[PDB]
Design a protein around this ligand. Sequence first.
Ligand code: NA
Ligand code: NA
Lengths: 421, 421
Amino acid sequence: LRVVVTGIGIVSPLGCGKELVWQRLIGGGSGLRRLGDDIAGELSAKVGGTVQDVAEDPEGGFDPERSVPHKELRKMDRFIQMAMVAADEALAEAGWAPEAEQQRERTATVVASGIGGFPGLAEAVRIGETRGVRRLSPFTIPFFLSNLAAGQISIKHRFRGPLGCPVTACAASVQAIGDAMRMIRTGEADVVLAGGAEAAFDKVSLGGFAAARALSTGFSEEPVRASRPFDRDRDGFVMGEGAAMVVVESLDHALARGARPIAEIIGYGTTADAYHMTAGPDDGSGAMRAMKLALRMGDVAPEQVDYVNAHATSTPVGDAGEIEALKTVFGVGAGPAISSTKSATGHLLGAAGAIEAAFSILALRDGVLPGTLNLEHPDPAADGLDLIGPAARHVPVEIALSNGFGFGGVNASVLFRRYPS
Amino acid sequence: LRVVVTGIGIVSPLGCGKELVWQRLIGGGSGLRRLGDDIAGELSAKVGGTVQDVAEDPEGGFDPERSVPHKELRKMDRFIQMAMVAADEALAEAGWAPEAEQQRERTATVVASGIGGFPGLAEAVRIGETRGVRRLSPFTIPFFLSNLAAGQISIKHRFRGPLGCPVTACAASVQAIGDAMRMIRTGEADVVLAGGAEAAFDKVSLGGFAAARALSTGFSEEPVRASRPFDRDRDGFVMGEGAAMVVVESLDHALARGARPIAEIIGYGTTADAYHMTAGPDDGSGAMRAMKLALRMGDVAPEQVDYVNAHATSTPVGDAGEIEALKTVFGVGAGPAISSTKSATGHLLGAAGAIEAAFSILALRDGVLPGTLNLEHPDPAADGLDLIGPAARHVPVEIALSNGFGFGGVNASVLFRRYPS
Ligand code: NA
Ligand code: NA
C-alpha cells in the first residue's frame, strides 16, 4: 500500500496554523525568546522557543479554548492542550470526522512526547512538599500521563482504533509517523492521527539539561541567535515547545473518500546506537543506518534525495555526529540540500519529529527549502555538504528526508515524495 | 510468519526469577506488604506489591548489581534497574547474545512503562525546591526518561535494531509485545526483547491515585487481603512494582538457531474506548473489541480459549467493566477459566502486561492456571463466568488470552498457544 499525508496541524514558537507558521519560517522568522525568570532565573540558559498567546500574537497565538471547553482544560497539562489544537487543524484539513462507528473503529491515534506532563508532575511534587499529598487534585495522574495527549484527542473525535504513545525522546514523533505507516500497512487502521506534543518548560527540566551542559548559554542578549545548527559558535540546544500532527492513510483510502494527498510517505527507518545514554557515536553510524533503511524502503538512491531536514539541534557533538552520518550516506560535492529548522523553532524534543516532517512535506508541496538561521561559519567537517544558509531556497524538489536522533541512542528517519510524483 | 517466545525474565513482588516467582504464585503466595511511612504515612492506602532486596528475600531478592556495576546504578532510576535484571534473565533463557553486528542490528528493544522514572523526577523537583536547580546531577534527565529502560538494555547487549517505549498505562507492556510481534512480521527485526518496567512508588504518585479514590484503603491490617479482583468487597487497586520481559522471534528463526519455543503468540488486538480519561465504559465495549481482534488474528473461536488472565485490578467499576466484556465475548455457562494474578502481585501498571503474559505462557507450559486470591464472594454480575477461586487449577490447556485495559481508554489483548500445538 502507498501511504499519504492528507492533513497537517502545527502549534509552535512561530505560531499556530501550518500556513501561517510556514510563511513566517520561509520569511526568515524566529520563535526564540527570553524565558521568564520563573523558569530560567537561576540558569545561564535564558532562551527558549516559546508558544505565545493571542495577546502576544493576535494572528497566530495559541488559544486552546477553541479546541476544549475552559472547564476541561483544567484536566490537561499544557502538552495535551497543544496536541488538541494541532490535531483539530490536521483533521480539519484532511476532512476526517467520522460519525459512524465503523470508521471510528478504524482510526488510530498515535502521539508521542519526550517528557510529557513535566510541568504538571513538578507542580504535584511541589504541592506535596507544601500543602501535603492529601491535597492533590483527583485529576493529578491523567493530567500528566504522556498517553493522555492521544487519549484526549481520541475522546474528542471518537477514534476507537489503536492508541499509541512512543516516548523515545528527540526521535519520538518521527517514530509516531513510522508507526502510523506500519499500521496502515498491516491493516490495523485505515487512518492514523499521528504526531507529537511537548511542553516541558520548568526550572527543573531546564536545570536538568543545564546540568548536562546541553543548553545554549552564550546568546541571552540576542535570543534569535542562540540556535545555530552546524555553526562554528553553536553552544547547546535551545529548548522549544509545541505540537504537530499529520493525518496518515493509504492513497486508495484517500482517493476513495475524495481527500487530497499533500505528500507520500515512501520510507521509514529506525535504529539504536547501543553506544551511550545521551551522546551518539562520533561517526554517526546509528543515524547513518536509519537513513539507509528509509532510503532502502523507498527504493531511492542517495543521489535522488533533494532535501534533508536534519536533526541538528545546535550542539557541538551532536551536530558533528549527524554531519559524519550525512557524509557517509550522501558523499560530498553533490548530494541533497540540508538545513535545520531548529534554528528557528528550537528543539521541540518529542514534537520535533512531527513539526520537521510537516516542514519537509511543505518544502515538497511549494518548492521552497527552509534555510538554517544563524549559519554564519559552517563547521569545516561539513565542507562538501550542501548546507543551506539563512535564506530559504526556492527550487522544485521531489524527495525529502527528515531525521530525529534522540537520547538513549534512538534514531529515526522518514522519507517523503511529492504528490503527484 | 509464526511468532514465538523463547525466553522470559521477571522482577516482581513475589521475587526475581520466573521459575521461583511461578512456584510462589502457584503455591498461593502474595507479594503485598505494608508500605513504608515515607511513601504512605499521610494516606489511608498502606499496602503495595513491593520488590524486596536479598536481605529480606535470600533466594529471590532483587540485586541489580548482578546486572549493572554499582557505579552505573547511580545513572538509572529504579524501573530501569529492574528492566535490566529482567532482561538479563529472559535473554539468558533464550540464549540470545549476538556478538556480530549483523545479528545485533536485527535485535529490537521494546520496553514499556506507564509512569517511568517518577521517583527520580520527584527527587529532582525536591532538590530544586531545597538546594536549587543549579545543584542538579548532570545525569538528571536520562536517569528518569522512560525510553532509557530499553536504552540501557540496548547499550549493555548491543542491540542496534529498533527501540520502542510505549507509554500507554496498564496496557503498555501488552502493546510492547504486540509491537514486537508486528516488527517480526514486517521484517524490521529478527528478535525483539519486549516488556515493561515500573517502579513508581512515591508519596505523590500514590497520593495522586488516592485523590482519585483509585486505591484500596480497607485492608491495611491484613495487607495480603487488599487485592481482590472480582470480589464483592474490593475497594481499589494495590500499586505494585517490577519488570517482566520476553524474547520474541519467528518460529523459523528460533529453530534455525536451536532455541526452544516456550509458547506461540497467535493474536494481538488493541483499541481505544474514546469514552472517558480514566474510567472505561460500563459495557466494556473497547475491551470486548480488543479481545475479538486478538481472537480473529488467531483464528480462534471464543469457545476454544482455555484461560484468560484478566486485567481486573480490584476496582469496583473497572472489574465490573471487564466482567461485562468477558460475557460479551465468551457468553456464560461454559467459556474459559478466568483469574487475575493482580490478586497476588498487585497492579504493576506498565509492567502488568508483560508479567501477566509471562504467567499466561507458564500456565500453558505447565498445565496450571493461577487462582484469584481473596475471591471470597464473587460479583453477582460474573455469575456464569468460570472464575477461578484462590487455589490454582491443574489442567492441561492449549490457548490463553491476557488483557490490559488502561487509563486514557487504551485496551490491548494478547493470545498465546501452547508449543507444540
Ligand atoms: Na528533522
Ligand atoms: Na492480564
